[PDB]
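Good morning N.,

You mentioned wanting to compare the apo and holo forms, so I went ahead and generated the holo version with fe (iii) ion. This is what I fed in:
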Amino acid sequence: SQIRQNYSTDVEAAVNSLVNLYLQASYTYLSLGFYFDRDDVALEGVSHFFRELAEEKREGYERLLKMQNQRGGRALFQDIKKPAEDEWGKTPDAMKAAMALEKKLNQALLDLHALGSARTDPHLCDFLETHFLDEEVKLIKKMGDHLTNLHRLGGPEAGLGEYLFERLTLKH
Amino acid sequence: SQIRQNYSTDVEAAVNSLVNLYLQASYTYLSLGFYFDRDDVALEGVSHFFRELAEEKREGYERLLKMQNQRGGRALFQDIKKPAEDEWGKTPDAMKAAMALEKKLNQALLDLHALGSARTDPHLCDFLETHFLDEEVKLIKKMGDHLTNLHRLGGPEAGLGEYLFERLTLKH
Amino acid sequence: SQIRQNYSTDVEAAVNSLVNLYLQASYTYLSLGFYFDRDDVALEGVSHFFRELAEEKREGYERLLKMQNQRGGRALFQDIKKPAEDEWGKTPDAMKAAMALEKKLNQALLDLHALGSARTDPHLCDFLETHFLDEEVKLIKKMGDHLTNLHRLGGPEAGLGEYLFERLTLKH
Amino acid sequence: SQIRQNYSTDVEAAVNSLVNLYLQASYTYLSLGFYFDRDDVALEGVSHFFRELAEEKREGYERLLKMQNQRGGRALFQDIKKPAEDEWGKTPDAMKAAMALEKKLNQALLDLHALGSARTDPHLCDFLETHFLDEEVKLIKKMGDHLTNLHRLGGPEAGLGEYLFERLTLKH
Ligand SMILES: [Fe+3]
Ligand SMILES: [Fe+3]
Ligand SMILES: [Fe+3]
Ligand SMILES: [Fe+3]
Ligand SMILES: [Fe+3]
Ligand SMILES: [Fe+3]
Ligand SMILES: [Fe+3]
Ligand SMILES: [Fe+3]
Ligand SMILES: [Fe+3]
Ligand SMILES: [Fe+3]
Ligand SMILES: [Fe+3]
Ligand SMILES: [Fe+3]
Ligand SMILES: [Fe+3]
Ligand SMILES: [Fe+3]
Ligand SMILES: [Fe+3]
Ligand SMILES: [Fe+3]
Ligand SMILES: [Fe+3]
Ligand SMILES: [Fe+3]
Ligand SMILES: [Fe+3]
Ligand SMILES: [Fe+3]
Ligand SMILES: [Fe+3]
Ligand SMILES: [Fe+3]
Ligand SMILES: [Fe+3]
Ligand SMILES: [Fe+3]
Ligand SMILES: [Fe+3]
Ligand SMILES: [Fe+3]
Ligand SMILES: [Fe+3]
Ligand SMILES: [Fe+3]
Ligand SMILES: [Fe+3]
Ligand SMILES: [Fe+3]
Ligand SMILES: [Fe+3]
Ligand SMILES: [Fe+3]
Ligand SMILES: [Fe+3]
Ligand SMILES: [Fe+3]
Ligand SMILES: [Fe+3]
Ligand SMILES: [Fe+3]
Ligand SMILES: [Fe+3]
Ligand SMILES: [Fe+3]
Ligand SMILES: [Fe+3]
Ligand SMILES: [Fe+3]
Ligand SMILES: [Fe+3]
Ligand SMILES: [Fe+3]
Ligand SMILES: [Fe+3]
Ligand SMILES: [Fe+3]
Ligand SMILES: [Fe+3]
Ligand SMILES: [Fe+3]
Ligand SMILES: [O]
Ligand SMILES: [O]
Ligand SMILES: [O]
Ligand SMILES: [O]
Ligand SMILES: [O]
Ligand SMILES: [O]
Ligand SMILES: [O]
Ligand SMILES: [O]
Ligand SMILES: [O]
Ligand SMILES: [O]
Ligand SMILES: [O]
Ligand SMILES: [O]
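and this is what came out, ligand included:
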């Protein structure tokens, strides 16, 4: 590569791998989005919530791909694994799954930062710090808040809570 | 002091002392504000409510300090005591604590008015009557209303009530 | 904590401690602000200068508190120690005190960055780098410039210099 | 009087007397104003300062006269005594004289408030509290600040200070 400088083969491949993780997370969110739009689930606000994250994750991988090109890395794509479930249960279940996905993404981000730091690649370290790390923290905090509100609305009259949360917290 | 006139050393020091009470009340509200923002509490509207009072109390003490300077008094600051609790419980608990704090502030205000009146210092009496006494009464009334609405939403399905009150009464 | 990830108990507590330092610095600036507003000090521009820093420091601790909540840390507050002095002398004295306070804050910031770096917590490292480190450097530079201008206006006709500096450098 | 109610003959006459004090204070300010406009004094900003107070004092007595009519009192005017001096010296001298005049006015105000309070005439007590007492306190504070700035600009190079203060503090 005429442009490549300070860009380890290790990072290059870990970036390719994080791309596949973003693709799969996007794909998971697509599944959660349409699931909440089913006539027998019918929670427009929850659907919108997940559709938006699908979009957010797509920006993630396109920004990773762009950065790959800018550093002189070469993108390589693998199969995108289908989401882990095909029915996602109730809002709290779905939200716990999302939370678990975000934590895995965040760990992958932190692991790549550790790696690029180990290769003293500050450009890469400062590409994650800016476009990913804070986004992940905000989002995880939000999902925590959501789970707390769903939990407080749970138990006996839980059908009613799921309705209220979708109507009064989520934007349609 | 070249400016001091009709301004008793007694008032001067009681004002310094009310300043410390405002500082501590502000500080209490700061604690209530962040507490309701914790991921495991998650009531944005309640948080906003207390954050705003912190701000209101800060205006209180800055107006007291300004008046001190205008009368030719000398400000003296003491340590600000940490808030009484570090976990504030549920909305009704927090609101009862706030109500108790406002009543203490109101009594301190009334006690200083009695004092300045006893020193026939009408300026001071009419500085409290204007900038503090009515503000306190309105605010206490509001917290009463709040407690009544929380109480009516309490008992068996109390998690649901706390959600509804934060969503439908408090502004986010 | 359902949200906590890569957030050491060490950082959590050092953040709580930096919060108390910001509270105390804010408190110091409040004291400097009203001091310069006394009828027998009477330097509106110097007063405004310190009042603004009080406000700046308050943003510091509220941003620290918010970040604490976002990482899943738990805020804990301690007593806020009264400022070190109750009379602050002349503009150069006050400004030297402010400079000394900012240097202490900056060292606390650098020490927390070292710590979070030692815990490989890049989120925290990049929260300080963005919202605090450059702000501190700019501010310290400004106070240096100020001290240089006050020093150049010092010595024999020093009362005149303090007037000119407040009128021609500070904004009222 | 068909309208008079709760309005003691004592207050009525003390109001007539405060009117004469306002007339005389206005008159003093007129003298200070033109004095600073003399070709051999030549401090436009100081002149403006006193001209404005003359105007302020005139509003004082017209508001007193209006209130007299509203309560069903009868205005009675006496001779207005010439000002105490015909040359007013330098800015600090003039400002010390003004300060002394304002303190006398403030004491007359406080004495009338005591009196109306002794006649349980809250209307009168609350006419002073609103239109006079705070105005006096602000103004006295301002004259204090002024004297402090003039004092800091005094001593050896005092001609230069008087120029700078008029140029940089007073509005022309
Ligand atoms: Fe979108
Ligand atoms: Fe869209
Ligand atoms: Fe959309
Ligand atoms: Fe988006
Ligand atoms: Fe986006
Ligand atoms: Fe984004
Ligand atoms: Fe977008
Ligand atoms: Fe974006
Ligand atoms: Fe299944
Ligand atoms: Fe960085
Ligand atoms: Fe970095
Ligand atoms: Fe809809
Ligand atoms: Fe506000
Ligand atoms: Fe605000
Ligand atoms: Fe606000
Ligand atoms: Fe407010
Ligand atoms: Fe306000
Ligand atoms: Fe207010
Ligand atoms: Fe406000
Ligand atoms: Fe206000
Ligand atoms: Fe506790
Ligand atoms: Fe009143
Ligand atoms: Fe009153
Ligand atoms: Fe909201
Ligand atoms: Fe500001
Ligand atoms: Fe401000
Ligand atoms: Fe301001
Ligand atoms: Fe600011
Ligand atoms: Fe700011
Ligand atoms: Fe800032
Ligand atoms: Fe600001
Ligand atoms: Fe800012
Ligand atoms: Fe001292
Ligand atoms: Fe960094
Ligand atoms: Fe000014
Ligand atoms: Fe005018
Ligand atoms: Fe005019
Ligand atoms: Fe005019
Ligand atoms: Fe006027
Ligand atoms: Fe006027
Ligand atoms: Fe007026
Ligand atoms: Fe006018
Ligand atoms: Fe007026
Ligand atoms: Fe004479
Ligand atoms: Fe009154
Ligand atoms: Fe001019
Ligand atoms: O969207
Ligand atoms: O987005
Ligand atoms: O985004
Ligand atoms: O606010
Ligand atoms: O406010
Ligand atoms: O307020
Ligand atoms: O401000
Ligand atoms: O600010
Ligand atoms: O700021
Ligand atoms: O005027
Ligand atoms: O006026
Ligand atoms: O006025």
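The two ends of chain D are 47 Å apart (CA to CA).

Happy to go through it together on a call whenever suits you.

Best,
F.
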